[PDB]
Coordinates of all heavy atoms in Angstrom, one line a residue:
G246 N -10.3 -38.7 -51.4 CA -11.1 -37.5 -51.3 C -11.4 -36.9 -52.6 O -10.9 -37.3 -53.6
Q247 N -12.3 -35.9 -52.6 CA -12.5 -35.1 -53.8 C -11.6 -33.8 -53.8 O -11.9 -33.0 -52.9 CB -14.0 -34.7 -53.9 CG -14.5 -34.1 -55.2 CD -14.4 -32.6 -55.2 OE1 -14.5 -31.9 -54.2 NE2 -14.3 -32.1 -56.4
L248 N -10.6 -33.8 -54.6 CA -9.6 -32.7 -54.5 C -9.9 -31.6 -55.4 O -10.0 -30.4 -54.9 CB -8.2 -33.3 -54.8 CG -7.5 -34.1 -53.7 CD1 -7.2 -33.1 -52.5 CD2 -8.2 -35.3 -53.2
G249 N -10.0 -31.7 -56.7 CA -10.1 -30.6 -57.6 C -11.6 -30.1 -57.7 O -12.5 -30.8 -57.2
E250 N -11.7 -29.0 -58.4 CA -13.1 -28.4 -58.4 C -13.6 -27.8 -59.7 O -14.8 -27.5 -59.8 CB -13.2 -27.3 -57.3 CG -14.6 -26.9 -56.8 CD -14.6 -25.7 -55.9 OE1 -13.5 -25.3 -55.5 OE2 -15.7 -25.2 -55.7
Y251 N -12.7 -27.5 -60.7 CA -13.1 -26.7 -61.8 C -13.6 -25.3 -61.4 O -14.7 -24.9 -61.5 CB -14.3 -27.4 -62.7 CG -13.8 -28.3 -63.8 CD1 -14.7 -29.2 -64.3 CD2 -12.6 -28.1 -64.3 CE1 -14.3 -30.1 -65.3 CE2 -12.2 -29.0 -65.4 CZ -13.0 -29.9 -65.8 OH -12.6 -30.8 -66.8
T252 N -12.6 -24.5 -60.9 CA -12.8 -23.2 -60.5 C -12.9 -22.2 -61.7 O -12.5 -22.6 -62.8 CB -11.8 -22.7 -59.4 OG1 -10.5 -22.9 -60.0 CG2 -12.0 -23.5 -58.2
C253 N -13.2 -21.0 -61.5 CA -13.1 -19.9 -62.5 C -11.7 -19.5 -62.6 O -10.9 -19.6 -61.7 CB -13.9 -18.7 -62.1 SG -13.9 -17.4 -63.4
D254 N -11.3 -19.2 -63.8 CA -9.9 -18.8 -64.1 C -9.7 -17.3 -63.9 O -9.2 -16.6 -64.9 CB -9.5 -19.3 -65.5 CG -10.6 -18.9 -66.6 OD1 -11.5 -18.1 -66.2 OD2 -10.4 -19.2 -67.7
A255 N -10.0 -16.8 -62.8 CA -9.6 -15.5 -62.4 C -9.0 -15.5 -61.0 O -8.1 -14.7 -60.7 CB -10.8 -14.5 -62.4
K256 N -9.6 -16.3 -60.1 CA -9.1 -16.3 -58.7 C -7.6 -16.8 -58.6 O -7.2 -17.7 -59.3 CB -10.0 -17.1 -57.8 CG -11.4 -16.7 -57.8 CD -12.2 -17.4 -56.7 CE -12.6 -18.7 -57.1 NZ -13.9 -18.7 -57.8
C257 N -6.9 -16.2 -57.7 CA -5.5 -16.6 -57.4 C -5.4 -17.7 -56.3 O -4.6 -17.5 -55.4 CB -4.6 -15.4 -57.2 SG -4.7 -14.1 -58.4
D258 N -6.3 -18.7 -56.3 CA -6.3 -19.7 -55.2 C -7.2 -20.8 -55.6 O -8.1 -20.7 -56.5 CB -6.7 -19.0 -53.9 CG -8.2 -18.5 -54.0 OD1 -8.7 -18.3 -55.1 OD2 -8.8 -18.5 -52.9
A259 N -7.0 -22.0 -55.0 CA -7.8 -23.1 -55.1 C -8.8 -23.1 -53.9 O -9.0 -22.1 -53.2 CB -7.0 -24.4 -55.1
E260 N -9.6 -24.2 -53.8 CA -10.5 -24.4 -52.6 C -10.3 -25.7 -52.1 O -10.1 -26.7 -52.8 CB -12.0 -24.2 -53.0 CG -12.4 -22.7 -52.9 CD -13.9 -22.6 -53.1 OE1 -14.4 -23.0 -54.2 OE2 -14.6 -22.1 -52.3
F261 N -10.2 -25.8 -50.7 CA -9.9 -27.1 -50.1 C -10.9 -28.2 -50.4 O -12.0 -27.9 -50.7 CB -9.8 -26.9 -48.5 CG -9.2 -25.5 -48.1 CD1 -9.9 -24.6 -47.5 CD2 -7.9 -25.3 -48.4 CE1 -9.4 -23.4 -47.1 CE2 -7.3 -24.1 -48.0 CZ -8.0 -23.1 -47.4
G262 N -10.4 -29.4 -50.3 CA -11.2 -30.6 -50.7 C -11.2 -31.5 -49.5 O -10.5 -31.4 -48.5
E263 N -12.2 -32.5 -49.6 CA -12.3 -33.5 -48.6 C -11.1 -34.4 -48.5 O -10.4 -34.7 -49.5 CB -13.6 -34.4 -48.8 CG -14.8 -33.7 -48.3 CD -15.1 -32.3 -48.7 OE1 -14.7 -32.0 -49.8 OE2 -15.8 -31.6 -48.0
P264 N -10.8 -34.9 -47.4 CA -9.6 -35.8 -47.2 C -10.0 -37.3 -47.3 O -11.1 -37.6 -47.4 CB -9.2 -35.5 -45.7 CG -10.4 -35.1 -45.0 CD -11.3 -34.5 -46.0
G265 N -8.9 -38.1 -47.3 CA -9.1 -39.5 -47.4 C -8.6 -40.2 -46.1 O -7.7 -39.7 -45.4
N266 N -9.1 -41.4 -45.9 CA -8.9 -42.2 -44.7 C -8.1 -43.4 -45.1 O -8.2 -43.9 -46.2 CB -10.1 -42.5 -43.9 CG -10.8 -41.3 -43.4 OD1 -12.0 -41.0 -43.9 ND2 -10.2 -40.5 -42.6
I267 N -7.4 -44.0 -44.1 CA -6.5 -45.1 -44.4 C -6.8 -46.4 -43.5 O -6.6 -47.5 -43.9 CB -5.0 -44.7 -44.3 CG1 -4.7 -43.6 -45.4 CG2 -4.1 -45.8 -44.5 CD1 -5.0 -42.2 -45.0
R268 N -7.2 -46.1 -42.3 CA -7.7 -47.2 -41.4 C -6.7 -48.3 -41.2 O -6.9 -49.4 -41.8 CB -9.0 -47.7 -41.9 CG -10.2 -46.7 -41.8 CD -11.5 -47.4 -42.2 NE -11.7 -48.6 -41.5 CZ -12.7 -49.4 -41.7 NH1 -13.7 -49.1 -42.5 NH2 -12.9 -50.5 -41.0
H269 N -5.6 -48.0 -40.5 CA -4.6 -49.1 -40.2 C -5.2 -50.0 -39.2 O -5.2 -49.8 -38.0 CB -3.3 -48.5 -39.6 CG -2.3 -48.1 -40.7 ND1 -1.1 -48.7 -40.7 CD2 -2.3 -47.1 -41.6 CE1 -0.4 -48.2 -41.7 NE2 -1.1 -47.2 -42.3
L270 N -5.7 -51.2 -39.7 CA -6.3 -52.2 -38.8 C -5.5 -53.5 -38.9 O -4.6 -53.7 -39.7 CB -7.8 -52.4 -39.3 CG -8.0 -52.9 -40.6 CD1 -8.1 -54.4 -40.8 CD2 -9.4 -52.3 -41.1
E271 N -5.7 -54.4 -37.9 CA -4.9 -55.6 -37.7 C -5.9 -56.8 -37.8 O -7.1 -56.7 -37.9 CB -4.1 -55.6 -36.4 CG -5.0 -55.8 -35.2 CD -5.6 -54.6 -34.7 OE1 -5.6 -53.6 -35.4 OE2 -6.1 -54.6 -33.5
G272 N -5.2 -58.0 -37.6 CA -5.9 -59.3 -37.5 C -4.9 -60.3 -37.1 O -3.7 -60.3 -37.4
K273 N -5.4 -61.3 -36.3 CA -4.5 -62.3 -35.7 C -4.6 -63.6 -36.5 O -5.3 -63.8 -37.5 CB -4.8 -62.5 -34.2 CG -6.2 -63.0 -34.0 CD -6.5 -63.3 -32.6 CE -5.5 -64.3 -32.0 NZ -5.8 -64.7 -30.6
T274 N -3.8 -64.6 -36.0 CA -3.8 -65.9 -36.5 C -3.9 -67.0 -35.5 O -3.3 -66.8 -34.4 CB -2.5 -66.2 -37.4 OG1 -2.4 -67.5 -37.7 CG2 -1.3 -65.8 -36.5
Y275 N -4.6 -68.1 -35.7 CA -4.9 -69.1 -34.7 C -3.9 -70.3 -34.9 O -3.1 -70.3 -35.8 CB -6.4 -69.5 -34.9 CG -7.3 -68.4 -34.8 CD1 -7.6 -67.7 -36.0 CD2 -7.9 -68.1 -33.6 CE1 -8.5 -66.6 -35.9 CE2 -8.8 -67.0 -33.6 CZ -9.1 -66.3 -34.7 OH -10.0 -65.3 -34.7
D276 N -4.1 -71.2 -34.1 CA -3.2 -72.4 -34.1 C -4.0 -73.7 -33.9 O -5.2 -73.7 -33.4 CB -2.2 -72.4 -33.0 CG -2.8 -72.0 -31.6 OD1 -4.0 -71.9 -31.6 OD2 -2.0 -71.8 -30.7
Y277 N -3.5 -74.8 -34.4 CA -4.2 -76.1 -34.6 C -3.2 -77.1 -34.0 O -2.1 -77.2 -34.5 CB -4.5 -76.4 -36.1 CG -5.1 -77.7 -36.3 CD1 -6.5 -77.8 -36.1 CD2 -4.4 -78.8 -36.6 CE1 -7.1 -79.1 -36.4 CE2 -5.0 -80.0 -36.9 CZ -6.3 -80.1 -36.8 OH -7.0 -81.4 -37.0
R278 N -3.7 -77.9 -33.0 CA -2.7 -78.9 -32.4 C -3.5 -80.0 -31.7 O -4.7 -79.8 -31.4 CB -1.8 -78.2 -31.4 CG -2.5 -77.4 -30.3 CD -1.5 -76.7 -29.5 NE -0.4 -76.1 -30.3 CZ 0.6 -75.4 -29.9 NH1 0.8 -75.3 -28.6 NH2 1.5 -74.9 -30.7
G279 N -2.8 -81.0 -31.5 CA -3.3 -82.2 -30.9 C -2.2 -83.3 -30.8 O -1.1 -83.1 -31.2
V280 N -2.5 -84.4 -30.0 CA -1.5 -85.4 -29.7 C -2.1 -86.8 -30.0 O -3.4 -86.9 -30.2 CB -1.0 -85.3 -28.3 CG1 -0.2 -84.0 -28.2 CG2 -2.2 -85.3 -27.4
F281 N -1.3 -87.8 -29.9 CA -1.7 -89.2 -30.0 C -0.5 -90.0 -29.5 O 0.6 -89.7 -29.8 CB -2.0 -89.6 -31.4 CG -1.0 -89.3 -32.5 CD1 0.0 -90.1 -32.7 CD2 -1.1 -88.1 -33.2 CE1 0.9 -89.8 -33.7 CE2 -0.2 -87.8 -34.1 CZ 0.9 -88.7 -34.4
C282 N -0.8 -91.1 -28.7 CA 0.2 -91.9 -28.1 C 0.3 -93.3 -28.7 O -0.5 -93.6 -29.7 CB -0.1 -92.1 -26.6 SG -1.6 -93.1 -26.4
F283 N 1.2 -94.1 -28.3 CA 1.4 -95.4 -28.7 C 2.1 -96.2 -27.6 O 2.7 -95.7 -26.8 CB 2.2 -95.5 -30.0 CG 1.5 -95.0 -31.3 CD1 2.0 -93.9 -31.9 CD2 0.5 -95.8 -31.8 CE1 1.3 -93.4 -33.0 CE2 -0.2 -95.3 -32.9 CZ 0.3 -94.1 -33.5
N284 N 1.9 -97.6 -27.7 CA 2.8 -98.4 -27.0 C 4.1 -98.5 -27.8 O 4.2 -97.9 -28.9 CB 2.2 -99.8 -26.7 CG 2.8 -100.5 -25.6 OD1 4.0 -100.5 -25.4 ND2 1.9 -101.1 -24.7
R285 N 5.1 -99.4 -27.4 CA 6.3 -99.5 -28.2 C 6.4 -100.9 -28.7 O 6.7 -101.1 -30.0 CB 7.5 -99.2 -27.3 CG 8.7 -98.7 -28.1 CD 8.5 -97.3 -28.5 NE 8.8 -96.4 -27.3 CZ 9.9 -95.7 -27.2 NH1 10.9 -95.8 -28.1 NH2 10.1 -94.9 -26.1
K286 N 6.2 -102.0 -27.9 CA 6.0 -103.3 -28.5 C 4.9 -103.4 -29.4 O 5.0 -103.8 -30.6 CB 5.9 -104.3 -27.4 CG 7.2 -105.1 -27.0 CD 7.0 -106.1 -26.1 CE 6.3 -107.3 -26.6 NZ 5.9 -108.3 -25.6
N287 N 3.7 -103.0 -29.0 CA 2.4 -103.1 -29.8 C 2.6 -102.3 -31.1 O 1.7 -102.4 -31.9 CB 1.2 -102.5 -29.0 CG 1.0 -103.3 -27.7 OD1 0.8 -102.8 -26.7 ND2 1.0 -104.7 -27.8

């Protein structure tokens, strides 16, 4: 956010500023699989 302002040096207070966002988001993971057979003598 925009916090500071460069105010005049007489007032005994600041002025509020815009806030910041964080956006806790997620994401998943996939899988890869397969099979294959065989004879035993062959």
